[PDB]
Amino acid sequence: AGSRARVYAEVNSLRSREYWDYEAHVPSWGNQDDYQLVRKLGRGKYSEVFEAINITNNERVVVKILKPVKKKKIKREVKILENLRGGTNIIKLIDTVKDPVSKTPALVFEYINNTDFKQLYQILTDFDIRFYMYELLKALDYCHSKGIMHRDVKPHNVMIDHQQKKLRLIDWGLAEFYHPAQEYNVRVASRYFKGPELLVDYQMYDYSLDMWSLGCMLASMIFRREPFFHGQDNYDQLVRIAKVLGTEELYGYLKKYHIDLDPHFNDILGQHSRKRWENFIHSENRHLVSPEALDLLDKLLRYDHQQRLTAKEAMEHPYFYPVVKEQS
Numbered sequence: 001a002g003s004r005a006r007v008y009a010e011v012n013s014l015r016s017r018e019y020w021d022y023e024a025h026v027p028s029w030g031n032q033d034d035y036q037l038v039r040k041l042g043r044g045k046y047s048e049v050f051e052a053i054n055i056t057n058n059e060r061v062v063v064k065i066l067k068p069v070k071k072k073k074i075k076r077e078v079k080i081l082e083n084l085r086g087g088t089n090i091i092k093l094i095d096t097v098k099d100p101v102s103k104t105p106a107l108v109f110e111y112i113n114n115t116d117f118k119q120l121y122q123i124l125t126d127f128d129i130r131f132y133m134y135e136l137l138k139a140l141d142y143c144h145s146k147g148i149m150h151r152d153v154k155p156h157n158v159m160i161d162h163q164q165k166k167l168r169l170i171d172w173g174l175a176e177f178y179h180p181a182q183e184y185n186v187r188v189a190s191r192y193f194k195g196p197e198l199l200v201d202y203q204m205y206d207y208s209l210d211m212w213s214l215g216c217m218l219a220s221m222i223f224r225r226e227p228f229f230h231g232q233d234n235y236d237q238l239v240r241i242a243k244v245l246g247t248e249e250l251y252g253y254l255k256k257y258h259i260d261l262d263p264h265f266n267d268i269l270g271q272h273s274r275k276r277w278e279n280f281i282h283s284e285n286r287h288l289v290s291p292e293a294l295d296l297l298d299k300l301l302r303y304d305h306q307q308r309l310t311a312k313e314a315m316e317h318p319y320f321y322p323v324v325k326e327q328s
């Protein structure tokens with residue numbers, strides 16, 4: 001009874017228990033021998049990712065081989081991906097497979113030809129940013145409507161094929177089901193994309209965490225400061241936020257939710273006014289900034305997770321009118 005989501009709060013309760021009870025999920029594990037690994041694409045604490053070919057039909061795919069130890073987390077990611085099947089701009093899980101001898105599991109995803117935006121021919125326009133942000137919001141509205149928080153929204157988890165104009169939200173390994181009043185682990189998201197709720201150890205968070213991360217991406221793309229809030233560690237991350245949003249405003253948020261603040265913060269927060277968003281504009285980013293971009297940003301990068309726009313409200317904002325008009 002501390003906080004709950006403004007949208008989609010009871011949606012899992014209204015579904016069959018099997019929908020959200022991922023520990024009870026029994027995946028159907030197909031045969032990894034149908035896939036030929038071509039090249040390594042990346043590696044994380046829990047997985048490694050390869051480009052591959054399905055030798056039975058010549059399809060190019062991505063294979064994520066899972067370090068098999070933590071079976072509950074595997075079931076969680078599999079069930080979430082199955083629940084999100086067909087969702088707009090969510091990476092498509094094609095199959096769940098195992099090495100038939102070792103039984104190590106892997107996930108097979110659709111291929112996306114991921115653009116490196118550091119190495120571009122013409123770099124992003126105002127319309128490009130509006131377009132891709134709208135496409136990303138479609139994925140977040142979809143997963144939130146499906147009762148799921150992504151909890152790791154960041155540029156590297158948003159694949160964009162800038163030639164075909166295709167966007168996919170990937171890496172659902174940290175995603176969870178939202179249940180009202182549930183207390184969640186705050187050790188989620190990338191440092192630069194962690195919401196203030198995580199940084200102050202507030203466990204009763206919801207889908208609005210992803211909307212903070214989204215806002216951080218919007219700020220970095222319109223202002224060209226990437227990442228926008230560049231903490232040196234989790235403590236400094238909150239200081240970077242407070243230098244923009246203000247310290248008195250932080251304390252008002254903490255008071256509202258009765259949040260205890262780790263006293264190490266007292267020695268590092270200092271005192272900071274809330275800054276005007278227009279302060280971030282200069283000649284190198286002016287062409288990407290508009291009154292409507294700043295109004296949207298202001299409504300996403302708020303301490304109070306409850307008062308941030310939902311993904312749908314964000315999609316409805318005038319910033320996206322040119323996108324909706326072109327899409328019609």
Ligand SMILES: OCCCn1nnc2c(Br)c(Br)c(Br)c(Br)c21
Binds near residue numbers: 062170172
């Ligand atoms: O869902 C976790 C996925 C991990 N992961 N890491 N790098 C990826 C790239 Br490049 C592409 Br293309 C795709 Br498709 C996926 Br899938 C990738």
Ligand SMILES: NCCc1ccc(Cl)c(Cl)c1
Binds near residue numbers: 043156170
């Ligand atoms: N968290 C997954 C990050 C990741 C790893 C590899 C690739 Cl190729 C991409 Cl796009 C993104």
Ligand SMILES: NCCc1ccc(Cl)c(Cl)c1
Binds near residue numbers: 128155156157158221
């Ligand atoms: N890896 C692509 C990250 C990215 C870049 C630009 C935009 Cl506008 C978005 Cl939504 C996402």
Ligand SMILES: [Cl-]
Binds near residue numbers: 183184
């Ligand atoms: Cl959790």
Ligand SMILES: [Cl-]
Binds near residue numbers: 243244
């Ligand atoms: Cl700053």
Ligand code: NA
Binds near residue numbers: 086087
């Ligand atoms: Na898809």
Ligand code: NA
Binds near residue numbers: 200201234262
């Ligand atoms: Na802390």
